[PDB]
Design a protein around this ligand. Structure first.
Ligand SMILES: [Mg+2]
Length: 79
DNA sequence: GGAGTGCGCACTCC
DNA sequence: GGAGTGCGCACTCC
């Protein structure tokens, strides 16, 4: 398990927040949300997002270079 | 003034 | 047909 589970949880909470705002849960929106909720800097959030995707605890969907991240508990439309 | 948020609506996709 | 996605702004906050 590469990501810190505490940070994975905060990122999953960020994904839920951004989804509820009806925006794509992108890297940038996730970083801003986790900065607001806990003061973690952009570099650390980006690292932990990538590690969580490698762990399988966060899902990554890519469309022509643009990424959307999903909670395994609420994966929405996935193929 | 600019960051942040809410959501109606056009578009996607099954 | 319609549920899901997120774009585009009206709106709110400091
Ligand atoms: Mg969970």
């Amino acid at each position: 398990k590469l990501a810190n589970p505490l940070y994975t949880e905060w990122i999953l909470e960020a994904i839920k927040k951004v989804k509820k705002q009806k925006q794509r849960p992108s890297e940038e929106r996730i970083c801003n949300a986790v900065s607001s909720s806990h003061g973690l800097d952009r570099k650390t959030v980006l690292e932990q997002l990538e590690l969580s995707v490698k762990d399988g605890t966060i899902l990554k969907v890519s469309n022509k270079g643009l990424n959307s991240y999903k909670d395994p508990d609420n994966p929405g439309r996935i193929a």
